Amino acid sequence: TVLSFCAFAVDAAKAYKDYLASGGQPITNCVKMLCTHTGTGQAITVTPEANMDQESFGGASCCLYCRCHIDHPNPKGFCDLKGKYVQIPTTCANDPVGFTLKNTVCTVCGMWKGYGCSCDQMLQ
Amino acid sequence: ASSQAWQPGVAMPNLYKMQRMLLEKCDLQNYGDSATLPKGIMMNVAKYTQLCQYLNTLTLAVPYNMRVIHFGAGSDKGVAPGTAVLRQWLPTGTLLVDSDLNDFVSDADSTLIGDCATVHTANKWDLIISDMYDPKTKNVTKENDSKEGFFTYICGFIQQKLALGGSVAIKITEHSWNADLYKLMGHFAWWTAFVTNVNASSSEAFLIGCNYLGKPREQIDGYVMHANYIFWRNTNPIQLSSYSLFDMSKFPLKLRGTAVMSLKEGQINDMILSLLSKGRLIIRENNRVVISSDVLVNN
RNA sequence: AUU
Ligand SMILES: Nc1ncnc2c1ncn2[C@@H]1O[C@H](CSCC[C@H](N)C(=O)O)[C@@H](O)[C@H]1O
Ligand SMILES: [Cl-]
Ligand SMILES: [Cl-]
Ligand SMILES: [Cl-]
Ligand SMILES: [Cl-]
Ligand SMILES: [Zn+2]
Ligand SMILES: [Zn+2]
């Protein structure tokens, strides 16, 4: 009867959006890496892949679930950020945690949807 | 030298290791000055980047499926900036374990929380990094004596768990040091004390042991060697510099595919020691890596 | 030591 426990789902992702909507201070101390900024620009990579419009951060430090020490909702409870590097557009690098929560990666090109993915797009 | 500012840091010149200096107070002309760090870069991302840039110039053994353990990886902010740099530096697939007395979240493959003395493993390691510092070291109560605490654990861990050919980088300061650790530097083909340019205003240095031989090639008196280290820091002023942080194109550790082989202390002849000394061989088994942290149970 |  673990449904009574799950039925009461503690939505931390939605709670963070409300906290920011209430003028809350974004989570700090996301670990920004030094890199060439000549990378592929993909969202989540084994090594920093920031291009000139992005900052690369240690993944675990940008994961709400890792930082708040709460279960991951991802399949089998695995983290998609821990042990990897997340590229965040420079315009949103002030809140990497909120960016990874509000955005999703394209399974085809590996780019963020709305910030690099051009799959939904002539003269050769 | 004006040339020091263009490097990631400064290694202690060999002539200092051969002196017999008296221990004195460490007095840096720029003590406590802040480095000008690139925008949004934490002190320890800058510091570990310079340590890794310097380790790139040494004969580190780099086998496929390398094993690295990082002690003192946690910070007062609950994240592990040093571990993130090590993971960026090390070859993809390197097994990286980190540990700290206090809770933190990291990019390591496994993290152990608790005193390093509670950490166990029957496996050998290729590289040991320690950034441990005991907060009580800031309360100078008994002169500048050799310290115990985690240093006794790291000396035992190096002698029991470091693969022959393996290397170490152990953080020391004017007051955070151990005589047995300096003596153990004589068990490597080569060693030095390295100061990062972003922390030139600190007595901090990394004692780097390159290519573990498992036997003393040079007898070192630890009390005298720490005095020689402080004499170097007192007479060679190092200016703060963040210059090396701006060129990252050659940062990742080169994949050498260093040979790994299993040998008994009876087969370690002079030809094998010659390969170990050149960074061309790692001696250990390739069994699965198993680690544990002892938990004290109280009623 | 965690500028
Ligand atoms: N006996 C011990 N066992 C394990 N960790 C210890 C220890 N004594 C001190 N430490 C740890 O040593 C660290 C020194 S500061 C380390 C900063 C870290 N390298 C970074 O990247 O920011 C502290 O986190 C402290 O908890
Ligand atoms: Cl200052
Ligand atoms: Cl643990
Ligand atoms: Cl002590
Ligand atoms: Cl073998
Ligand atoms: Zn996570
Ligand atoms: Zn796409």
- What is the distance in A from the centroid of ligand 4 to the CA of B136? 9
* Bridging pattern class, strands B259-261 and B281-283: parallel
- CA B172 to CA B147: how far, in whole Å? 10
- Say how far residue B239 (Cα) sits from the centre of its chain: 22
CA B181 vs CA A61, B36, B111, B146: distances in Å: 33, 32, 25, 10
What are the CB-based long-range contacts (under 8 Å, 24+) for B262-270?
A: B265/B214, B268/B164, B268/B214
- CA A1 to CA B39: how far, in whole Å? 51
Residue with tokens 């780019």: A111
In chain A, residues preceding a discontinuity (C to N beyond 2.5 A) are: 121
With CA atoms as reference, report the closest residue to B92 among B102, B107, B105.
Answer: B107
Tokens of residue B199, six digits? 């922390």
Please report, for chain A, the start and end positions of each structural domain, with discontinuous segments joined by +.
7-124
| CA contacts within 13 A on the Cβ side of B47 | 22
* Eight-state DSSP code of residue B7: S
- CA A80 to CA A44: how far, in whole Å? 8
With CA atoms as reference, report the closest residue to B245 among B5, B55, B8.
Answer: B8
Residues 15-44 of B with CB under 7 A from strand C: 34-37, 42-44
Contacts (Cβ under 8 Å, ≥6 apart) of B42: A29, A31, A32, B81
Amino acid found at A102: K
Helix-helix angle B43-55:B81-89, to 10 degrees: 30
The string of DSSP letters for B56-110 reads: TTS-----TT-EEEEES---TTSB-HHHHHHHHHSPTT-EEEEEESS--B-SSSE
- What is the distance in A from the centroid of ligand 6 to the CA of A67? 7
Conformational region of residue A32, where left means phi above 0, alpha means psi within -120 to 50, and beta covers everything else: beta
Min Cα–Cα distance to chain A from B294, Å: 21
Instruction: Spell out a b/e string for B225-236, using b for 16 or more CB atoms within 10 Å of the CB, else e.
Output: bbbbbbbbbbee
Q: What angle do CA B211, B12, B158 make, to 5 degrees?
A: 30
* Bridging pattern class, strands B162-172 and B125-130: parallel
The approach used to solve this structure was: X-ray
Residue with tokens 């260093």: B258
- CA A96 to CA A78: how far, in whole Å? 19
Contacts (Cβ under 8 Å, ≥6 apart) of A62: A30, A81, A86, A88, A96, A97, A99, A100
- CA B213 to CA B272: how far, in whole Å? 10
Residues, chain B: 299
What structural domains and CATH numbers belong to chain B?
Answer: 3-299 (3.40.50.150)
Please report, in angstroms and rounded to a whole number, the separation of the first and last CA atoms in chain A: 60
Residue with tokens 């090590």: B86
Nucleotide nearest to B132 in CA–C1' terms: C1
Interface membership of B109 toward A (CB under 8 Å): yes
- CA B172 to CA B175: how far, in whole Å? 8
Taking the alpha carbons of A94, A100, A102, A106 in that order, is the dihedral positive or negative?
A: positive
| C-beta of residue A99 within 8 angstroms of C-beta of residue A63 | no
With CA atoms as reference, report the closest residue to B275 among B259, B256, B253.
Answer: B259
Give which of B41, B50, B83, B88 to mutate to test A binding, by max A Cβ within 10 Å.
B88
Does the annotation flag A63 for ligand binding?
yes
Q: What angle do CA B237, B241, B246 make, to 5 degrees?
A: 155
Amino acid found at A65: Y
CA B103 vs CA A51, B72, B98: distances in Å: 33, 11, 11
- CA A51 to CA A87: how far, in whole Å? 8
- CA B58 to CA B166: how far, in whole Å? 12
Residues 200-219 of B with CB under 7 A from strand C: 202-204
- CA B205 to CA B218: how far, in whole Å? 21
Q: What angle do CA B89, A72, B112 make, to 5 degrees?
A: 50
Chain A with chain B: Cβ pairs closer than 8 A = 70
Does the annotation flag A30 for ligand binding?
no
The string of DSSP letters for chain A reads: -THHHHHS---HHHHHHHHHHTTPPPP----BPP--S-S---SEESS----TTEEEEESGGG-HHHHTT----SGGG--SSTTSEEEEEGGGTT-HHHHHHH--B-TTT-PBTTBB--TT----
B15 by DSSP, 3-state: which?
Answer: helix
B228 by DSSP, 3-state: which?
Answer: helix
CA B288 vs CA B96, B122, B157: distances in Å: 13, 10, 18
- CA B280 to CA A11: how far, in whole Å? 53
CA B206 vs CA A90, B182, B253, B290: distances in Å: 34, 11, 18, 27
With CA atoms as reference, report the closest residue to B190 among B163, B160, B220, B161.
Answer: B220
- CA B245 to CA B9: how far, in whole Å? 11
| C-beta of residue B244 within 8 angstroms of C-beta of residue B8 | yes
| C-beta of residue A44 within 8 angstroms of C-beta of residue A7 | no
Contacts (Cβ under 8 Å, ≥6 apart) of B110: B97, B98, B291
Q: What angle do CA A101, A104, A108 make, to 5 degrees?
A: 160
Rounded (10°) CA dihedral A92, A95, A100, A106:
10
Catalytically active residues of B are: 47, 131, 171, 204
Rounded (10°) CA dihedral B272, B182, B135, B290:
20
Resolution, Å (one decimal): 2.0
